[model samples]
Target: QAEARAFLSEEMIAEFKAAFDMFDADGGGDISTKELGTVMRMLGQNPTKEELDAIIEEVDEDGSGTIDFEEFLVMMVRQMK
Candidate 1:
């Protein structure tokens, strides 16, 4: 199952992109707290302050108070681990 569970490669990005789309509420290629919270709530999670702030700190590279696609991907993959 190693092959099936491997971290994403180019071929898997397409699928990942599709999954990511579901969270892009504004479709501006960025995800805000509202969008992020949607996913968390859907997954039966209530985001903690530490988790939220950590995401903002890392992904909000421009201090825009939102997360870009790349930022979202990086944070999701890392924070969840």
Candidate 2:
């Protein structure tokens, strides 16, 4: 799938996988909204609940209410562009 291939560079994929796996602690494929927001808070900035929800709203592809690795990859890649 061309859409899937959009952000699969070796270095980024490896690095992103590491980050994704870290937050995906329960072995669940998707990162829960609370977990992801906590990660963001831990890194420094404090995002309001509204902001966090809006971000997930924008990037969440399947409406699974969590961000899967593919969505995370695309989100990170889009930040670079």
Candidate 3:
């Protein structure tokens, strides 16, 4: 599992988790690749499959081949910076 407070303050981390959970529709404890594109669309980033796949490949630290809340937060926080 990813550390929540690594990138943001505790309060801000909670906020990010809430946002991450919003996209966790299946409640599977992580975001699926198919759903990842849906999130990209919501963020107004129309990534190609290869583009999205590359993202998962880069951030999927656990090698589960999916993005957990921590990886999700890391990506978002990096974008913010």
Candidate 4:
């Protein structure tokens, strides 16, 4: 969510990056198109293929083939108050 960049903290940004690294699996900063589903797997929220697709489609803001740090954080905190 480069769109939500000003709405967050550096630490929050870092955590969101960590969430991405967690799924990257090989220390890469970008995830494969399919790895978005793996994110839910690592998060303990095992969504089926259709569910994963819909969620990733919603979060991947820039359409650059992966969710950036800001995108991840916006989507994450959106689950919060």
Residue 34's lDDT within candidate 2 is 82
TM-score of each: 0.65, 0.79, 0.74, 0.62
**Candidate 3: pairs in clash:** none
The residue-by-residue lDDT of candidate 4 on 2-81, one tens digit each, is 54566677787787777677777666565655687765666787678777667667877677756655666777778664
lDDT of 2: 0.80
* True-vs-predicted CA distance for residue 38, candidate 1, Å: 1.2
Model 3 agreement with the true structure over 21-45: per-residue lDDT tens digits: 8878788899877788898899988
Which runs of model 4 end up more than 4 angstroms from their true locations? 42-46
Model 3 TM-score is 0.74
Question: Residue 3, candidate 3: how far off, in angstroms?
Answer: 6.9
Q: Which stretches in model 1 have alpha-carbon errors above 4 Å?
A: 1-8, 48-51, 76-81
Q: What is candidate 2's lDDT per residue for 40-68, written digit by digit as tens?
A: 88899798878888888887988887888
Q: Give all candidates' CA lDDT scores.
A: 0.70, 0.80, 0.80, 0.68
Most TM-score-accurate candidate: 2
Lowest summed lDDT over 10 consecutive residues: which window, candidate 4? 25-34
lDDT of model 1, residue 61 = 62
lDDT ranking, best first = 2, 3, 1, 4
